[PDB]
């Protein structure tokens, strides 16, 4: 369970940094 | 503004925007159909709402209305005889007003009727300019023939009275008191509102002393509970739970009863709601319904999971409100395991770490904080009074495994276990209480009460528990020794243990003479049984050294009439026999057995 969380968190951070890069495009 | 708007929806989770200044765990109304939910995160102007009801068909840009409150109870006249769910929706008004067999999504009936007019009497020596503080009684509503519903100033409110109503009939929406503090006014109707998760305050919290009577011989003698006590029962099918609930409801020295269903099967809940309105008790020589002093919280296993988890917090907050009036309240929770499963589902929906057996890390802290609200108290506010809440909470271990986290935490906290038992119920032994597993820890607290009011009872209880233990110790030995070759002292132990087990511990609650066994009858019977035990023991021990010694056969042959009179003691009837008559008869058996043994000595 602790490894299925943390993988969700790393995916969320990647999606936030992706969207926050589209704000520069 | 009180309105934000739905940004996104995914399952029961709603995310809303323009929610700036909404607060943690506030309730909201979501959508055009006004579904209830609670705020579980804050981030910028956005909030995340955990919606309780079905979010199907909610749309982006729907309104979200913030309520300035966390989850809270309306407390005031009209609670007696009410049926509520775990978030105080009035199930019997929702049926009446909707003309439907279902509960609508986003139904918004208020918990207490704002329609009915209540007959209000002020405190008669309050006047304009009087100084007043939280918990002060400022009037009474004549709610029914049993309950004076005492109108109290809320906790966290105080001041100088600027106005008080004259006597008359008022709505729950009429202002009946107004007061001022620091030049700021407060206007008050008969109904207050209190958060379910906040303990209602008191002047002092007191040691429990007086017994809670059930009218059952076992329970009231062997395993007593105090007013303000905490108890668990094994909640399983064949064990016969209803004797506890009906004894509390009909015969106990409670003033008020609160019953909570936590998440019951549809048809099991229906039997409680069928049976409870039909129960009656006799008051001042007149028969009265149980529902004049009772309120039910009811939840079937398909009610919103947040209601299933709130259920015990609604029920204890309703109990603490009648404690504060100076009453003694009994609370029954139908299974606390069904509540802990709702707590597991909610923490699972939140994706919390699964700790022990999938339950959240706080399971034991929630159960300790719940049972800690039990106790005798000295109430807030001016008229000097005491009240109490007693908790009985059923628990349902899987296959009888007490190592289950909920059951282990519960039996780690409660001070009494009334071990109802299917293996006794299958013998038609009623009530089904296992006298070898069952226990009470209140016996050092009840000592000075029994010492004052009954005096001889504490030795009698002690010898009775010993006889009922020796007959377990002998239960293997008899199979090897073949009964006949046993000592006469121990034959006396076996067959007085049979007398106690068959004629003291059994109590058929359908029979008119044993529905309710008052405590003077209960000590009177046990006094005679133990007196016969001592005399039979003495008759053997006086002669067994070298005489033509006394035997338990000689005693049964010489005293079989007395041994039948002892079995006849349970048939004495407080409805038709006075206390003095029952006392005289039990004294006559004590003279008769002395004359019989003195004719053998």
């Amino acid at each position: 369970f602790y490894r299925l969380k943390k993988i969700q968190e790393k995916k969320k951070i990647i999606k936030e940094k992706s969207e926050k890069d589209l704000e520069r495009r | 503004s009180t309105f934000g708007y739905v940004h996104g929806v995914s399952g029961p989770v709603v995310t809303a925007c323009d929610m700036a200044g909404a607060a943690m765990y506030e309730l909201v109304r979501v959508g055009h159909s006004e579904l209830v939910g609670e705020i579980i995160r804050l981030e910028g102007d956005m909030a995340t709402i955990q919606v309780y009801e079905e979010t199907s068909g909610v749309s982006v840009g729907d309104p979200v209305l913030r309520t300035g409150k966390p989850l809270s109870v309306e407390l005031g006249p009209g609670i007696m005889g009410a049926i509520f769910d775990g978030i105080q929706r009035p199930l019997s008004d929702i049926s009446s007003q909707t003309q439907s067999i279902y509960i609508p999504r986003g139904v918004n009936v208020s918990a207490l009727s704002r329609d009915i007019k209540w007959e209000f009497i002020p405190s008669k020596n309050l006047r304009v300019g009087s100084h007043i503080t939280g918990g002060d009684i400022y009037g009474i509503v004549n709610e029914n023939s049993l309950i004076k519903h005492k109108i109290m100033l809320p906790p966290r409110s105080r001041g100088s009275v600027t106005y008080i109503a004259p006597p008359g009939n008022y709505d729950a929406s009429d202002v009946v008191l107004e007061l001022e503090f620091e030049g700021v006014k407060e206007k008050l109707s008969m109904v207050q509102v209190w958060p379910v998760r906040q303990v209602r305050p008191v002047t002092e919290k007191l040691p429990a002393n007086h017994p809670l009577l059930t009218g059952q011989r076992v329970l009231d003698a062997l395993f007593p509970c105090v007013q303000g006590g905490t108890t668990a029962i094994p909640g399983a099918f064949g064990c016969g739970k209803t004797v506890i609930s009906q004894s509390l409801s009909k015969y106990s020295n409670s003033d008020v009863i609160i019953y909570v269903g936590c998440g019951e099967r549809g048809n099991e809940m229906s039997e409680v709601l069928r049976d409870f309105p039909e129960l009656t008790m006799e008051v001042d020589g007149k028969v009265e319904s149980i529902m004049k002093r009772t309120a039910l919280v009811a939840n079937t296993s398909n009610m919103p999971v947040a209601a299933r988890e709130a259920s015990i917090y609604t029920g204890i907050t309703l109990s603490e409100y009648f404690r504060d009036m100076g009453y003694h309240v009994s609370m029954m929770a139908d299974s606390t395991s069904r509540w802990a499963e709702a707590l597991r589902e909610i923490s699972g929906r939140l994706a919390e770490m699964p700790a022990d057996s999938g339950y959240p890390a706080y399971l034991g802290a929630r159960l300790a904080s719940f049972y800690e609200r039990a106790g005798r108290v000295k109430c807030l506010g001016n008229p000097e009074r005491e009240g109490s809440v007693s908790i009985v909470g059923a628990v349902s271990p899987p296959g009888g495994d007490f190592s289950d986290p909920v059951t282990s935490a519960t039996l780690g906290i409660v001070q009494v276990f009334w071990g109802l038992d299917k293996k006794l119920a299958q013998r038609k032994h009623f009530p089904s209480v296992n006298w070898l597993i069952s226990y009470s820890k209140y016996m050092r607290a009840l000592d000075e009460y029994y010492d004052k009011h009954f005096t001889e009872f504490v030795p009698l209880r002690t010898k009775a528990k010993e006889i009922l233990q020796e007959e377990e110790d002998l239960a293997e030995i008899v199979q090897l020794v073949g009964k006949a070759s046993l000592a006469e002292t121990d034959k006396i132990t076996l067959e007085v243990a049979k007398l106690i087990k068959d004629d003291f511990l059994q109590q058929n609650g359908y029979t008119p003479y044993d529905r309710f066994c008052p405590f003077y009858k209960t000590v009177g019977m046990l006094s005679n049984m133990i007196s016969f035990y001592d005399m039979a023991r003495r008759a053997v021990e006086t002669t067994a050294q070298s005489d033509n010694k006394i035997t338990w056969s000689i005693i049964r042959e010489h005293m079989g009439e007395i041994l039948y009179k002892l079995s006849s003691m349970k048939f004495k009837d407080p409805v038709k026999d006075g206390e003095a008559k029952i006392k005289a008869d039990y004294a006559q058996l004590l003279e008769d057995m002395q004359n019989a043994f003195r004719s053998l000595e």
């Binding site: - | 996104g8 399952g11 199907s56 840009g61 049926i83 067999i101 279902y102 039997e271 069928r274 398909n302």
Partner: protein
């Protein structure tokens, strides 16, 4: 009243990802809304809005996402959530797991349109269960009797004949005919292999009984969202028939373990973390939403009774699916691998089986006065007979008392005459009780400890 305004169509697909299509620039998305997709080749597909956020909607397509593109594929949002047409004309019809006919009859004219999610029955309205549902199977009607408004699962395992028992209950069930008319059956089957789906459809036509039956079939290779919809179409039809058309309805739900399989698959597409033993954390609430759509209600003559049928992995009753079902439902009937291996049918073991509401179904004016006594005495003699059979190989039969030899004769005749029944043999509760008395008459009446002397006086002697 009617929705009246025109549907929007979009080519704004932003991404495609397993079973999900994501669209953007959507005008006020509605959660759980139904949408229709047209593929680049003109193929049509369907989906449901799985989530919404701002201008984005994500759709689970019911069919696959294969052959969908970003450029040419288009989607029409219907304006509304999933509703079913419903009527009394659904009896005698066969449907798929999304409510389309599969019987060569026409589509249903609605008497009403209903949201399949329904609403919870008010605890104040629900009234306690009462008279028996006669299933026609002696191991259920005799010793595990089912009350009108009870919900009571059958627990089974891989390879056991639970589909044959389900089909037999469906062919035989009714009201007891003391001293059919207002009865109906709604049969819903989830994740069914084609050989089993053909068995149900064939056996209900061949044995005439279709005029009482509404049948929903979801096959093992149909879309898994139709498996989520199937119980909700079935119970939405049972609620109309019982609480509006005043029928007594029996609902049979076939393999709830195939429903829980699809529920886990939907939860994983939402990217939710697997809960306990692999299933969703809310699976108790989800099953309780199906099971508590049951019972009698005040002011209405109809009722809904349910039989959820389950398959346990490793034959282990402690798995989440049979575990959580036991906390919501009120009994279990237990299908047994040792009886199946000895070639007995139906292989129901009466010892671990229970109906909790049996006392409310049986007795005078509801079955017969002796039913409560005969059920308890048969159980006792079967329990004792199983114990004697076990010791016979320990001590040898020459060590046994004459009392033990009466029980070991009863055991063999109980399993041959009472438990064993034909898949096309139908016994009333009276044939079930009379076969019971033919076995109890093996014993001297003074050994029948559970039966009172009043009952023995009337029923123990053979009549002329």
């Amino acid at each position: 009243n009617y929705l009246s305004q025109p549907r929007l169509t979009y080519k704004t697909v932003s991404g495609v990802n397993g079973p999900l299509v994501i669209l953007d620039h959507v005008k006020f998305p509605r959660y759980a809304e139904i949408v229709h997709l047209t593929l680049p080749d003109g193929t049509k597909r369907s989906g449901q809005v799985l989530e919404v956020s701002g201008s984005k909607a994500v759709v689970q397509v019911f069919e696959g996402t294969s052959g969908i593109d970003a450029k040419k594929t288009s989607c029409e949002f219907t304006g509304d959530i999933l509703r079913t047409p419903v009527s009394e004309d659904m009896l005698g019809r066969v449907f798929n797991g999304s409510g389309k006919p599969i019987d060569r009859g026409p589509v249903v004219l609605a008497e009403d349109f209903l949201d399949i999610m329904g609403q919870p029955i008010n605890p104040q309205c629900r009234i306690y269960p009462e008279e028996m549902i006669q299933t026609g199977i002696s191991a259920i009607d005799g010793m595990n009797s089912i009350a009108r408004g009870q919900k009571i699962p059958i627990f089974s395992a891989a390879g056991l004949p639970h589909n044959e028992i389900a089909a037999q209950i469906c062919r035989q069930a009714g009201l007891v005919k003391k001293s059919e008319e207002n009865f109906a059956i709604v049969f819903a089957a989830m994740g069914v292999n084609m050989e089993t789906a053909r068995f149900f459809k064939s056996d209900f036509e061949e044995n005439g009984s279709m005029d009482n039956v509404c049948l929903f079939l979801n096959l093992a290779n149909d879309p898994t969202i139709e498996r989520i919809i199937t119980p909700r179409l079935a119970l939405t039809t049972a609620e109309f028939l019982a609480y509006q058309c005043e029928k007594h309805v029996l609902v049979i739900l076939t393999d709830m373990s195939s429903y829980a399989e699809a529920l886990r698959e939907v939860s994983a597409a939402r990217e939710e973390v697997p809960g306990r033993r692999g299933f969703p954390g809310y699976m108790y609430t989800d099953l309780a939403t199906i099971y508590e759509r049951a019972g009698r209600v005040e002011g209405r003559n109809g009722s809904i009774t349910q039989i959820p049928i389950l398959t346990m992995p490793n034959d282990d009753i402690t798995h989440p699916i049979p575990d959580l079902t036991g906390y919501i439902t009120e009994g279990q009937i237990y299908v047994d691998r040792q009886l199946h291996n000895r070639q007995i049918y139906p292989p129901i073991n009466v010892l671990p089986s229970l109906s909790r509401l049996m006392k409310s179904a049986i007795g005078e004016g509801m079955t017969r006065k002796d039913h409560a006594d005969v059920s308890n005495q048969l159980y006792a003699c079967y329990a004792i007979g199983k114990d004697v059979q076990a010791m016979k190989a320990v001590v040898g039969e020459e060590a046994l008392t004459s009392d033990d030899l009466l029980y070991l004769e009863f055991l063999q005749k109980f399993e041959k005459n009472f438990i064993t029944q034909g898949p096309y043999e139908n016994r009333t509760v009276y044939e079930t009780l009379d076969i019971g008395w033919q076995l109890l008459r093996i014993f001297p009446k003074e050994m029948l400890k559970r039966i009172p002397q009043s009952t023995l006086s009337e029923f123990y002697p053979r009549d002329s």
